[PDB]
Design a protein around this ligand. Structure first.
Ligand SMILES: [Mg+2]
Ligand SMILES: [Mg+2]
Ligand SMILES: [Mg+2]
Ligand SMILES: [Mg+2]
Ligand code: NA
Ligand code: NI
Lengths: 855, 858
């Protein structure tokens, strides 16, 4: 805003027109402070991503500095809001925020990932100039991965009448849904109503359930409560029951959403209108056969995902986040674990609308700091909250851990995508001292979660289960006794079996799996020189497993509910095997600064293993993908100059061919068929059982041929169980690879060629480097320069390469393995964006993006 | 890429080239590494793919030129061995240098005339050969968009050592007018060369037969007496064919003949050479004008620049042929190739289509124009170097004579070509005295009369109307030599004085009108105010200060038997010269993006006609009827004068028009008005119509059409046409919009391909017009929706266009805004037969899909 007045929506965007300064000496909380030389910024904003890399920082957190940042916004509150209540909401600030309003200190908030709020009412100047100030102190080292710094999530203002529904004030339960499904469904609601006026109110609620977007004419249930007197200055929980007439279920394939609207009446008139989003669905976890959704067995085909958005840094841009989910859905992913901290609300929103199941994790460490990170949340978890700290969002009577956990649950309690609360990750890993206190701390978190929300199972991800620690056994039983689910980090097949034998009562899953480490487009070796790693699936960390192995072990076992592979997307920091937990660079500078863990790189460009997962997980598409790229200077030659050719596919049978350079005739190289296996619960998977099968069982989840090198084309044909061809139009992946010429042309394409002109929406522009005939040159690293004209601007450039230290805010970047990305953002005026990609000696490429005015 | 006998005597050499843009590289060596260079098929324009820049000139569309290198490596078989080889260029713009296998063959300045190089002397038989062309379009070189590079076809000629010379056959029929119907005498002259090491005893067997074309249907043959021609020498062999009753080449029946020359040495045939011909004669009388084959004909002509719109300067045969087809439908029967030799392809189409061509060779002479220090003005008078082995025309004087005779040599037998034009406004936009021009003029005239005697020479002079002494002197020299004087931009009053003070001259409007209009713009009826949307009215009330509106320039010509005809500037819009936002130096005009193609065109660059097209159709095409109404009838596009009355204009050739109105929501039409034309007849017997009612316009020429002032209201304005006997003229025999209706909002695209089956040769095109219409199919008059094209199958997208001048969007993109409801995609076939699928899409609108068949070469 620049001015706040009636009638903005009850909750309105407050992202625009802030001023920013990086200084650990300035004191700028006074409204009369001169900030004329400060940067003007729109939020969300990350001030680590704009600073330089430095060897004096830590590899763990991408060698980037944190620091003390100040944010100021001056805005008018019109006289017409005089008797209204005003609050400011932060979906996240990393970290150690301090908030002032018109010179008065309101309070503080340590945790960089939980949402919080401040009432502004008591200090507001109605009919005047106002100044809100936020001091942020990301004092390093505070993180095991790249955190970023600043107000990296959206900010809103909430304006209401004196009588109003409390912050996150509606809870909905449907405890008999499974039985009532298709008929009248009982909704039990509880609504906190606050009377912040100087007279008693006679309150009735009018609550309505209707399809999202969506008018009240199409409601499927309503209720009006009996009159309840709420005294001046008091609040009350108001229980109500809605009978919902045959609601449509929220499922992965059809994620139906409803709006649940609460109108607060006092006397005869409506004073407040509160909406919350809801979906009808139920889940189950069973010790013997795993997970179910709405009464149907479902395998949790999941990824772990850190919060950052690549070249954008920590900024929680809704489209950036929506794009990640889309790319993951294409892989066959149906679930995300928010490692290791609450997600942005934007992710929750996207998963509600797209039909993705979320395991929302709240904490990494508990009351013991990890990896030498003396300023991490470990230092805060068990501290108390000062009585004059006015911060709002959760329970304030015990510790920060209770506040941040209940604050997170309060925000997302009605979101259908969220299926479990995860309370910790590897709590006893990388810390110092006794772990004798960890069972009691766990039981305490479990009790708080149960009392906050009875509708979902709680969990955690624990890596000492495989080591059989007593503390872990005790903690596991405690989860179970409270209807929770036990997540084991990095167990193999044999350990899954041991847990199941040793603990028959536990419902279990793979809460962190694989940790395969690969670069994109790397073929001149097949096993784990140039600060890159093979793209073949034969490279994992010592405690981890390659992708085929971690899946093979899960797919055979109905009692292992699912897997959350580490990770879906590469993220900034933890550049294992070049990681470092203290100060200083690893290997020669520039050192790898982002992860190798991801199936998809930071730019959103899939690595080869993407198509293995797709062949395993996506039953809505077929897959046929060949590696390696077929250029002499990128392949690996084994015995007899034979190259390992790998095919990932969900087909029943594959024929492999070769075409010589300059020929139009292909000859047959090989032919292989899979075997269908079926588990007791009815899950099916495919394995190769021919007599030339690999000696390692899991590698038979895919196909390998040893092919002599020669210039030309390797191509594949796919057949179903009835020996009918599976045509190219129905199949994803590279069904052929060919020897390319030298780089000659750029080829750009935008993912969405029409976007919203709201100063927020993004268009992602992939640029390929190709030869004269359009084949992507596999090792091309040509420097590409973007020229953006019209109603938008370049906000990022990326190539996903870990050792690339070039600025993400530059207008140019080297391609890596033939690809480079540019990200363009709209303005607040409708128009058109023209983007030209250029490289020396190559043909240029132009895309055209239209931007449309907000309805 | 290899040349094997018996591939045709002349074969298409367009495929498999390599190109790089660089003024630094030196790539004339066969060893030079091509591997990173772009791969291109000719013809090719490398200006059109570059970006617009305010650093360039408005005149030439704000596009750059630069240095382009072309490389082709190929193998010469032993299947040949000992034969003569030559490479032929129809055009390279400009300043070309040629190496072969490393040896510099020579250079050629002019970007518009054809040329050749013998490759025999430096060839590698049985081995590998590398031809290299360097192109240097140093800007500023042109008053309009030229393009750069090898923008016309390239061929190889492979012959025996004893062979007909290049363009080696000249045909004359001096007594055709008398002999017509009977035996017609053909006087031939053939250059025969003996590039062997021994003498040869030669006879010629020449045969004339109908095009396509067996010799069993010949109408004349001759065998010459044995001539001895020595080794290393050539001899002009005259001969005579007696043609038995040849069918004439005329506009309605353009009969074409193949004249085949066999060269015999001893018993056998050593070389066989063909040239296209047509039997026809013309006259220019100072009193009654022009005639073809004894019959008076009025030259209804347009000026046409070389480029093909979104394709740039590329002389694609189908793009060329489509232009002519569109002009023919307008009733045009003659084209002036302004201001430079045409592509041979354009001479081929007119030969076949029955269009009269005036082939102009030069713009400026030996004085450069418009600050264009690198135009042909600096080369015109230069001499040709002794070691410059470039072939085509005479080399003993200047480039002026070389390019002039090279053009005459290529097309001396073309039946379509009626005149040679030797310049255009030679004294305009130059510095210094003009004292020297009457001499330069007389020299060019002498060069032409000596080169080809069968055609009159001419030029286009804009200083006659200003009565310059030098123009009088030059016109007299024209006349003395059997010439015809073309005057640029004379009106009725000035045509008459010319006729009075110079009674011996035969004259015509060499350049006329220069009306300036956008396609589909109606919210103002004049260019009387200064525009603000970078467009101009579609009403014919807009022309440059030296020019005239279309009805006025035609009114003046039709009334005067002594003005043989007109060549309207222009038939089609072209890139560059974007008057009245033109600029002759560097920098942009008005706010950027600045207008970058012309407004002069009757038809826009995409081939969509402007409204005035149907005015000309009503004046010119006697094979169709015309009934056309403007404006479009939406409230936000019309212009309201007094009383909220909109000027409605009807262009028609009918005798009588009834004008109606139908209120929105009704099916009942009411009569608004009714008007009838009067027929007029000149001394020579030409007829035209003018309105002489009591409510006629006070300006006479505006009465060649009909106007009504009509109050605005939602609904449909429609028209009925009647002949002189009061019998209705049905819609099925009439062209134009005979109704206009208030549309709804844009709802759907309607796509259509002009040809639904094209040739799979990698050259042929299908033109896909897309209209933005409402739910009921009416074109929304101001629709500017961005349309995106998905091309799949045996073809590819090569251009997109909307004809809008200030639109700078790349012509190579797969999308473009429509302009005034219309947009077009050009698609090209591949060399494999198949099916092309093209889907047009736009946000919020229904899509439209067409399928194009492509069929193999037989
Ligand atoms: Mg992202
Ligand atoms: Mg599948
Ligand atoms: Mg100039
Ligand atoms: Mg007619
Ligand atoms: Na992998
Ligand atoms: Ni550390």
């Amino acid at each position: 805003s620049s001015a706040v007045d009636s009638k903005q929506n009850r909750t309105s965007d407050f992202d625009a027109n802030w001023k920013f300064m990086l200084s650990d000496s300035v004191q700028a909380q006074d409204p009369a402070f001169d900030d004329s030389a400060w940067q003007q910024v729109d939020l969300p904003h990350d001030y680590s991503i704009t600073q330089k890399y430095s060897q004096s920082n830590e590899a763990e957190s991408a060698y980037l500095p944190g620091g003390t940042g100040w944010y100021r916004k001056s805005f008018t509150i019109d006289r017409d809001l005089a008797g209204k209540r005003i609050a400011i909401n932060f979906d996240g600030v990393y970290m150690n925020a301090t908030v002032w309003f018109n010179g008065v200190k309101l309070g503080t908030h340590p945790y960089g990932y939980s949402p919080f709020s401040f009432d502004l009412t008591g200090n507001a100047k109605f009919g005047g100039e106002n100044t809100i100030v936020v001091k942020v102190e990301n004092r390093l080292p505070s993180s095991r991965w790249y955190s970023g710094s600043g107000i990296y999530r959206d900010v809103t203002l909430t304006v209401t009448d004196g009588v109003h529904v409390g912050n996150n004030g509606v809870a909905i339960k449907t405890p008999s849904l499974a039985t009532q499904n298709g008929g009248n469904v009982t909704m039990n609601l509880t609504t906190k109503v606050a009377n912040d006026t100087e007279a008693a109110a006679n309150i009735t609620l009018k609550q309505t359930v209707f399809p999202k977007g969506g008018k009240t004419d199409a409601a499927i249930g309503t209720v009006t409560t009996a009159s309840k007197s709420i005294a001046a200055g008091a609040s009350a929980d108001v229980t109500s029951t809605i009978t919902a007439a045959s609601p449509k279920l929220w499922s992965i394939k059809n994620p139906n959403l409803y709006t649940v609207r609460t109108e607060v009446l006092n006397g005869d008139t409506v004073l407040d209108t509160y909406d919350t989003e809801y979906g009808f669905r139920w889940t189950g976890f069973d010790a013997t056969s795993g997970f179910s959704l709405n009464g149907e067995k479902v395998k949790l085909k999941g990824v772990s995902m850190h919060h950052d958005q690549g070249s954008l840094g920590a900024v929680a841009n809704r489209r950036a986040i929506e794009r990640q989910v889309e790319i993951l859905q294409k892989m066959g992913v149906n679930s995300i674990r928010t490692t290791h901290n609450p997600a942005a609300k934007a992710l929750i929103d996207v998963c509600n609308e797209k039909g993705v199941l979320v395991v929302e994790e709240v904490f990494d460490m508990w009351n013991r700091s990890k990896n030498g990170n003396t300023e991490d949340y470990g230092k805060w978890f068990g501290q108390t909250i000062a009585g004059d700290n006015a911060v709002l969002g959760g329970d304030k009577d015990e510790t920060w851990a209770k506040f941040d956990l209940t604050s997170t649950i309060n925000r997302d309690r009605n979101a259908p995508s969220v299926i479990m609360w995860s309370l910790g990750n590897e709590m006893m890993e990388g810390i110092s001292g006794s772990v004798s206190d960890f069972p009691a701390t766990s039981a305490k978190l479990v009790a708080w979660t149960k009392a906050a929300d009875s509708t979902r199972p709680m969990t955690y991800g624990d890596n000492k289960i495989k080591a059989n620690w007593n503390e872990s056994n005790t903690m596991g039983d405690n989860l179970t006794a409270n209807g929770g689910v036990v997540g084991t980090n990095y167990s193999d097949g044999a350990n899954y079996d041991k847990i199941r034998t040793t603990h028959p009562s536990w419902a279990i899953y793979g809460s962190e799996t694989a940790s395969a480490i690969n670069s994109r487009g790397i073929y001149n070796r097949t096993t784990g020189s140039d600060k890159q790693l093979t793209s073949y699936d034969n490279s994992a960390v010592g405690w981890g497993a390659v992708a085929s192995s971690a899946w093979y072990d899960v797919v055979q076992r109905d009692f292992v509910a699912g897997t959350y592979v580490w990770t879906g997307f590469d993220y900034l920091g933890e550049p294992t095997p070049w990681n470092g937990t203290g100060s200083g660079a690893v290997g020669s500078w520039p050192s790898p600064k982002n992860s190798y863990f991801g199936i998809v790189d930071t730019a959103g460009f899939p690595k080869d293993t993407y198509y293995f997962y797709q062949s395993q997980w996506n039953d809505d598409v077929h897959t046929l993908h060949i590696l390696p790229a077929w250029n002499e200077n990128v392949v690996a030659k084994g015995s007899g100059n034979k190259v390992p050719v790998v095919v990932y596919t969900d087909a029943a049978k594959v024929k492999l061919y070769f075409t010589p350079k300059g020929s139009t005739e292909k000859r047959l190289i090989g032919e292989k068929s899979f075997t269908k296996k079926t588990t007791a619960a009815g899950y099916t998977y495919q394995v190769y059982e021919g007599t030339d099968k690999d000696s390692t069982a899991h590698k038979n989840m895919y196909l390998t041929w040893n092919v002599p090198w020669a210039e030309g084309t390797i191509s594949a044909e796919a057949y179903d169980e009835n020996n009918r061809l599976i045509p190219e139009g129905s199949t994803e992946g590279n069904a052929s690879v060919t020897t390319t010429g030298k780089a000659a042309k750029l080829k750009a394409d935008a993912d969405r060629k029409t976007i919203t002109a709201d100063g927020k929406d993004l268009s992602y522009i992939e640029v390929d480097v190709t030869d004269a005939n359009g084949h992507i040159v596999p090792d091309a690293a040509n420097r590409v320069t973007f020229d953006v004209k019209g109603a938008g601007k370049l906000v990022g450039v990326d190539n996903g390469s870990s050792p690339d230290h070039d600025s993400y805010q530059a207008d140019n970047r080297k391609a890596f393995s033939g690809k480079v990305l540019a990200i363009v953002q709209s303005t607040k005026e409708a128009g058109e964006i023209t983007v030209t990609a250029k490289a020396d000696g190559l043909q240029s490429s132009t895309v055209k993006i239209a931007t449309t005015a907000v309805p």
